[PDB]
Amino acid sequence: MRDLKTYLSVAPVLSTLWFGSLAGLLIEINRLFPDALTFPF
Amino acid sequence: TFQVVQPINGDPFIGSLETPVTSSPLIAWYLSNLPGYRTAVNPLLRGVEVGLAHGFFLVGPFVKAGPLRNTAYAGSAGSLAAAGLVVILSMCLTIYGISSFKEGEPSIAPSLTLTGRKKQPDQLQTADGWAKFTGGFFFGGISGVTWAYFLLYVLDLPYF
Amino acid sequence: RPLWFASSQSLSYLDGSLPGDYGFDPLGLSDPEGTGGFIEPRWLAYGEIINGRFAMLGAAGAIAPEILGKAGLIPAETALPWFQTGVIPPAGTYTYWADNYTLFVLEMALMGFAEHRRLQDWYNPGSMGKQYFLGLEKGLAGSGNPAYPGGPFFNPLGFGKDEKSLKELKLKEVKNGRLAMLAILGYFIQGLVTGVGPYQNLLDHLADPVNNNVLTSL
Amino acid sequence: DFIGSSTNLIMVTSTTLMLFAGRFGLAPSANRKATAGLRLEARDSGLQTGDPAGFTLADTLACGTVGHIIGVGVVLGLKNIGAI
Amino acid sequence: LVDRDPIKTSFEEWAKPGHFSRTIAKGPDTTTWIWNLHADAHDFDSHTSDLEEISRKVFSAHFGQLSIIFLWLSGMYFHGARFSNYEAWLSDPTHIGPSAQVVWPIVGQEILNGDVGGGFRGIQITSGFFQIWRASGITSELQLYCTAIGALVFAALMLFAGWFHYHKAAPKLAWFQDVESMLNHHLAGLLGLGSLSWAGHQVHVSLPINQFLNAGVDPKEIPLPHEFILNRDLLAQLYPSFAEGATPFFTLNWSKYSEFLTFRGGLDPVTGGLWLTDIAHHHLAIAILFLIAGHMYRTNWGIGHGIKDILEAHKGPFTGQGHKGLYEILTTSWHAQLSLNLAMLGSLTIIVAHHMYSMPPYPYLATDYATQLSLFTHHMWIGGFLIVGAAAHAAIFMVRDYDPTNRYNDLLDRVLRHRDAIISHLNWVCIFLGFHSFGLYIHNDTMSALGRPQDMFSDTAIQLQPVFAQWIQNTHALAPGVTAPGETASTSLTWGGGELVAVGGKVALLPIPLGTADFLVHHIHAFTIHVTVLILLKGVLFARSSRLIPDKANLGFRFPCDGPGRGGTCQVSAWDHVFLGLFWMYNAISVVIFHFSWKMQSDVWGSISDQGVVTHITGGNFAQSSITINGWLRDFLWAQASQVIQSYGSSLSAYGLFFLGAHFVWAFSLMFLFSGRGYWQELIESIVWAHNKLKVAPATQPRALSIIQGRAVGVTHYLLGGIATTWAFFLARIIAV
Ligand code: CLA
Ligand code: CLA
Ligand SMILES: CC1=C(/C=C/C(C)=C/C=C/C(C)=C/C=C/C=C(C)/C=C/C=C(C)/C=C/C2=C(C)CCCC2(C)C)C(C)(C)CCC1
Ligand SMILES: CC1=C(/C=C/C(C)=C/C=C/C(C)=C/C=C/C=C(C)/C=C/C=C(C)/C=C/C2=C(C)CCCC2(C)C)C(C)(C)CCC1
Ligand SMILES: CC1=C(/C=C/C(C)=C/C=C\C(C)=C\C=C\C=C(C)\C=C\C=C(C)\C=C\C2=C(C)CCCC2(C)C)C(C)(C)CCC1
């Protein structure tokens, strides 16, 4: 549906999806590599 | 249907209302006989009466609540404080009379009764009348304080 | 016409067109102002007819195996009361050629076909006689009245040839359906408070009425 | 016996008295409305009853409920003080 | 009275924001459009003028509210079955802290999974759900899972009903205005039948299971609830009167049911709560009373009362026509009903909060101090908010729906003709109470500082005894046997009977003394409440006009000002009066909760020893230290905040973080309250300039917040920060000790 796809492009829904994916990625990254203080490579 | 509250003097466009608290015959008689509402009497006598009544009153709180209430100097200190308060009130009255009234001008009191009858304006609203009132108030207050102190701590009356 | 607890509000719309109409509507549910949803006189009449027919089927079904069991005609293992034949397994169960939950799915599928066809007839009349359905759609065209479809399938004997006779038979059907609904309510509630078969209730009452009664059962 | 007991007589009397009062205009009803001066006023309820006085089923149910309430209250009150 | 398919179900309106308004739907020229979109979301009266459509819209949203509440209940019940130690707590309620929340270990937050007993690690909860579940006879987790499933199903049903009664069959206006039928149904069915059903559940399930639990039987060996119904022998063994069945009920031999329907009063020594038989009898009586009350109003059958007839018959020589015309106002305006209901609900919530603490209705609830404190503060705050909303919507009705041409009422007209006297008298009362209540605290502070303890208002120098309340306590302590012969003990243990109840070595309840400090704090409460009432009533009464702005009704209910003329006209609308009264509501509720907390910690709660000596938490310092502001600052704020500031490195560090977070949020609100819009609009102009330089200027022109929006943001952040600070402090203090 075109009208359903239009509602998914509104600012709050897109922001929520983007930030949820971002937070998931950051949480997983910190889970894999915990307690990082310096860049060792 | 019977109604109790009425517009003031039958005029509904004046910002007041007539209620039993204001227009009861007992309350109307009681207020008209107070010394502050006797517009045909010398202001000096009304001031003397007001001063006596207020000066007799002021002794009690100062005597019973003062810092020296639990000592032998309670009554004298209370009477002295009451006299000082009476002096301050007299100063305030004198200042108000000086600032508000000007010499030579006629009275500003209303000259119409509630029923429309014409009457002489009260002389309390002039400089001379207010000065007489203030002097009488001072004299009456001092006399009342003295009388209260005499009764309380010169005659061993079984009070309380 | 006779009236039964009629009211001025009820008589304003119950003019006697429907079969078995006595003007009885104290709550005014068939009031034709602001009709909608499932509150609608036509839908209510259709539901009453369907419920009466099902209760008529169910009233005799819940008692038929019982009376022959006491009559020595069928094996006693099949002469069970309606509440123990497997409807409520905690109350008792009987082993069939398949487990109860397997029978339930087949029953649901067949009844779904039947009831969906009936509902689609109701929504758009005359529709079931158009699409090919094993060549049986010729006789499933209906008659324009949802509760009385007729046709070679539902009216094989051709009863009710005369309009007055049809009116009489409709009245008898309505009366019998109401009586069957009352009997089914009696079945349920009697089974609730006595715990034995309704035929056993009748036999106990006929044994003596003063010792087996509401005053002694409650 | 319970049938001849005082409770039976009291409750039957209460119900009968309430029904009689409702029927013969001694109490308000569907066709009788009491005003602010506690005076009954004639009214039409629009319900067919087949009764000469117009006593409908709702009036009968209300009168029965009031009679039962009064009878239960009287029975329990007399039982508490040990009178019955 | 319904309409078939009024509105088509489609996604078309989803892609066009602001469809409910003509102006908003035009497009976002500036950023004010986005803010205006949310502020007018639920103002159905502004969208359309048809009363039927507004009623239909209002009817549907309540279904969504009910669905949300059902989802919340489902979550609460599910968490207690999967992530809780309820079964372990059931075998030792006095030594195990309830917990129903666990945390994933990611960034070191697993320290919050503190030890609570029963071999469990989690966050200790203070909502009191464990006591509710115990009082209902719940033993295993399967029952909780079934309850969660049922709540989910009910939420789905509510959502479907909400969709249906708006898109398929919407009731007409004549359906909504049947107030007599609605009252009859909500009285007889919603309340009476619910009370009857709960009484039946308590009689058949809660009583035997709770008796078995109080006997000390292992919860896993207690028969299941259905075993007491199928096997009447068990109930007959527990209660011999059950062997007779329902015969005594129908023969009016109700005295046989005295074994499980009592009139005892007081608390159960084993658990510390009210007797469950008393609760069952109470619910039965309440069900009967509510069932009788639901047959008053007239319906299709003639018998009953007409609300209009009742209203039209009340008038007096002072009030003129009286209550004539009030029926039409309340059946045409949604705002007046909302205001009245909000006020009544807030008052009821405050009453419930006051009643729950002194009459503990749940087992092992009096000895759970954190739960008691949390429930009290929560319900008080909810009541205050509802009370403020009542006045807000009363002002809204006054501004919008008032029309003397077609909806004249004599009582409303007479009130508006002497509002000056009411406001002036309330002002004088507020000033007098403030002088003679707070002034006594400053006097005590000055005398203490000067070194004259004998000239203070205290129990040792100048007593101000609350003789009236002590008389009530004495009368209630002597009520049984004289004025309540059927009672065995008093309604509450706080009246001054002299008896003390101790459960598990802790003090549950005991008589509460009243002295000089209670006098002062009660008068402080009265002063604050009077000021709040003054503000709200002044806002409501002058909503349409005043001597300053004669045409205030034309400007609307929510407008910022009327210019700098007449010396200044800032915050003259009725909205600003609610904005101002929220602060005073916050002040009053904070003072009340501080009084409650200190008094209970100092004079009630404590521990008892073998010899029977009570040692309170703070040692009974409320009487001599609360009479000065320095005492409140030192012995309450400074002394009791050491728990929250020393919570770092333990399972209570979340409260320590919330303390500073709420400090920051509260301090952040002063930027919006102390400043104005012009400065921020002028500052934005410079920021926009550099964006234009780099071709990053948006087409949606940035605009500063409006005056009303700024005030709302300020008050919201202020309230949030203050309440969060108090919440963190209270929980951190009470969980540790
Ligand atoms: C039964 C309760 C009830 C109901 C049905 C209503 C209904 C209504 N109120 Mg109302 N009100 C209530 C209680 C209630 N109120 C109470 C208790 C108060 C006192 C506090 C008020 C104070 C009030 C005011 C001052 C106004 C209304 C207005 C209105 C109308 C428009 C509502 C609107 O647009 O809001 C839109 C809703 C929002 C914008 C949501 C607000 C967001 C809250 C405040 C912040 C929550 C913070 C949260 C925890 C942080 C998470 C954020 C997240 C994104 C991360 C509507 C008829 C307005 C009106 O009639 O104007 C003509 C109006 O001006 N009400
Ligand atoms: C991509 C968009 C964008 C770009 C390129 C810039 C660029 C700039 N901003 Mg800025 N700003 C933006 C969005 C943007 N802003 C937004 C949305 C806001 C409102 C929150 C602000 C608020 C803001 C202020 C208050 C100030 C600047 C300032 C500045 C300048 C100093 C550099 C800097 O880091 O400032 C710091 C930049 C920020 C603090 C902005 C926060 C980051 C935002 C949230 C990113 C959002 C991007 C947006 C979602 C794009 C979506 C892309 C998507 C459609 C694909 C620089 C030219 C400063 C200046 O020199 O004054 C002119 C200054 O004082 N900005
Ligand atoms: C918790 C919860 C839940 C659940 C709930 C439930 C489960 C409920 C139930 C309920 C019920 C289950 C109810 C019932 C009821 C009943 C009734 C209400 C009845 C009545 C009756 C009557 C009233 C009668 C009467 C009578 C008389 C008077 C005379 C004659 C005889 C008789 C007996 C008939 C859920 C999941 C939702 C979720 C949330 C929470
Ligand atoms: C406060 C609150 C809450 C809660 C609440 C609740 C819990 C409620 C409940 C309620 C209820 C719980 C109700 C109920 C109702 C009703 C009912 C329950 C009914 C039933 C049944 C019936 C109606 C029946 C009937 C009958 C029968 C049986 C048969 C025959 C006929 C008759 C009619 C008799 C919360 C916290 C959450 C939130 C806030 C607020
Ligand atoms: C002469 C005559 C007659 C008569 C009859 C009669 C008069 C009968 C009646 C009877 C009746 C018509 C009765 C009724 C009743 C009713 C009721 C009774 C209702 C209800 C009630 C209730 C529901 C209540 C409840 C309760 C409870 C449960 C508990 C507490 C107490 C009370 C009581 C409140 C006839 C028609 C044959 C024929 C013609 C002639």
Q: Who contacts E597 (Cβ-Cβ below 8 Å, separation ≥6)? A: E373, E730
Q: Who contacts C21 (Cβ-Cβ below 8 Å, separation ≥6)? A: C1, C14
Name which of E559, E553, E563 is nearest E573 in CA terms. E559
CA nearest E454 in B: which residue? B67
Instruction: Give the SS3 label for residue E266.
Output: coil
What are the distances in angstroms from CA E81 to CA C57, E98, E143, E146, E448? 46, 13, 9, 10, 56
Kindly give the distance from the C-alpha atom of residue D15 to the centroid of ligand 5, in angstroms, as a whole number. Answer: 7
Asked whether E145 lines ligand 3 (CB < 6 A), one says: no
d(CA E71, CA E124): 22
User: What b/e string do you get for E443-477 counting C-beta neighbours within 10 Å, with b at 16 or more?
Assistant: ebbebbeeeeeebbbbeeebebebeeeeeebeebb
Residue C22 pairs in a beta bridge with none
d(CA E312, CA E349): 32
Do E317 and E305 contact (CB within 8 A), yes or no? no
Strands (E), E237-368: none
DSSP summary character for residue E103: -
Q: Kindly state the helix (H) or strand (E) to which residue E123 belongs, with its residue range.
A: strand E121-124
Q: Does E455 touch chain B (CB under 8 A)?
A: yes
CB pairs under 8 A between C and E: 18
CB pairs under 8 A between B and E: 13
Do B102 and B90 contact (CB within 8 A), yes or no? no
Do E111 and E87 contact (CB within 8 A), yes or no? no
Technique used by the depositors: cryo-EM
d(CA E12, CA E94): 59
Residue C147 backbone phi and psi in degrees, to 5: -80, -20
Handedness of CA E204, E208, E210, E211 (dihedral sign): positive
Q: Who contacts E464 (Cβ-Cβ below 8 Å, separation ≥6)? A: E440, E457, E516, E519, E520
User: What b/e string do you get for E419-441 counting C-beta neighbours within 10 Å, with b at 16 or more?
Assistant: eeeeeeebeebbeebbeebbebb
Do E272 and E363 contact (CB within 8 A), yes or no? yes
Q: To which residue do tokens 């500031």 refer? A: E645
Name which of E277, E364, E276 is nearest E86 in CA terms. E364
| CA-E193 nearest atom, ligand 3 | 18
Residue D56 pairs in a beta bridge with none
State the distance between the two ends of chain A, measured CA to CA, in whole angstroms: 49
* Residues in chain E closer than 8 A to C28 (CB atoms): 300
Chains E and B touch (3+ CB pairs under 8 A): yes
Name which of E616, E585, E653 is nearest E507 in CA terms. E616
User: What b/e string do you get for E17-39 counting C-beta neighbours within 10 Å, with b at 16 or more?
Assistant: bbebeeebeeebeeebbeebbee
User: Where would I find the H helices in chain B?
Assistant: 20-23, 25-32, 43-65, 74-100, 127-153
How long a stretch of residues is chain B?
A: 160
Residue D32 backbone phi and psi in degrees, to 5: -140, 115
d(CA E732, CA E737): 9
Residue A32 backbone phi and psi in degrees, to 5: -70, -40
What are the distances in angstroms from CA E679 to CA C185, E569, E672, E674, E676? 79, 20, 12, 12, 6
Structure tokens at E476: 């209630």
Do C120 and C127 contact (CB within 8 A), yes or no? yes
Q: Kindly state the helix (H) or strand (E) to which residue D60 belongs, with its residue range.
A: helix D57-80
CA nearest B15 in E: which residue? E418
| CA-E41 nearest atom, ligand 1 | 34
Q: Angle at CA E609, nearest 5°, toward E608 and E614?
A: 40
d(CA B132, CA B44): 5
Structure tokens at A34: 């915990």
Structure tokens at E243: 């062997």
Q: Who contacts B117 (Cβ-Cβ below 8 Å, separation ≥6)? A: none
DSSP string, E323-351: STTHHHHHTT-HHHHHHHHHHHHHHHHHH
DSSP string, E11-66: SGGGGSTTTT-TTGGG--SBTHHHHHHHHTSS-HHHH---HHHHHHHHHHHHHHHH
d(CA D10, CA E620): 61
Structure tokens at E138: 């719940």
Do B130 and B47 contact (CB within 8 A), yes or no? no
d(CA C91, CA C83): 7
Kindly give the distance from the C-alpha atom of residue D33 to the centroid of ligand 3, in angstroms, as a whole number. Answer: 36
Q: Does E418 touch chain B (CB under 8 A)?
A: yes
Closest CA–CA distance from residue E407 to any residue of chain B (Å): 22
* Residues in chain E closer than 8 A to C9 (CB atoms): 300
Strands (E), E483-609: 501-503, 506-509, 606-608
Specify the resolution in Å. 3.2
Residue B26 backbone phi and psi in degrees, to 5: -65, -45
Closest CA–CA distance from residue C24 to any residue of chain D (Å): 11
B17-18 vs D32-34, strand pairing mode: unpaired
d(CA C117, CA B23): 87
Residue E249 backbone phi and psi in degrees, to 5: -65, -45
Q: Kindly state the helix (H) or strand (E) to which residue D40 belongs, with its residue range.
A: strand D40-42
Q: Kindly state the helix (H) or strand (E) to which residue B7 belongs, with its residue range.
A: strand B6-7
CA nearest C4 in D: which residue? D48
d(CA E412, CA E396): 15
| CA-E69 nearest atom, ligand 4 | 37
d(CA E563, CA B103): 44
Instruction: Give all strands of the β-sheet with E121-124 in edge-to-edge order.
Output: E99-101, E121-124, E114-115
Cα-based torsion angle of the residue sequence C113, C117, C123, C126 in order, rounded to the nearest 10 degrees? 170
Give Cα B53 to chain centroid, integer Å.
8
Handedness of CA E476, E481, E486, E487 (dihedral sign): positive
Give Cα E416 to chain centroid, integer Å.
31
Residue E620 backbone phi and psi in degrees, to 5: 65, 45
Residue E637 pairs in a beta bridge with none
User: Where would I find the H helices in C74-162?
Assistant: 100-123, 151-154
Closest CA–CA distance from residue D23 to any residue of chain E (Å): 14
Instruction: Give the SS3 label for residue E509.
Output: strand
* Residues in chain C closer than 8 A to E177 (CB atoms): none
Which residue of C28, C34, C37 is in closest CB contact with E172? C34
Region for residue E697 given its phi and psi (left: phi exceeds 0; alpha: psi -120 to 50; beta: otherwise): beta
In single-letter form, the type of residue at position B127 comes to: A
Name which of E658, E735, E654, E662 is nearest E113 in CA terms. E654
Which chains would you list as touching B if contact means 3+ CB atom pairs under 8 Å? E
CA nearest C32 in E: which residue? E1
d(CA E149, CA E146): 5
d(CA E222, CA E210): 10
Handedness of CA E485, E487, E489, E490 (dihedral sign): negative
d(CA E247, CA B60): 75
Do E91 and E218 contact (CB within 8 A), yes or no? yes
d(CA C199, CA C81): 9
Q: Who contacts E295 (Cβ-Cβ below 8 Å, separation ≥6)? A: E184, E188, E304
Q: To which residue do tokens 């459960």 refer? A: E503
d(CA E413, CA E61): 34
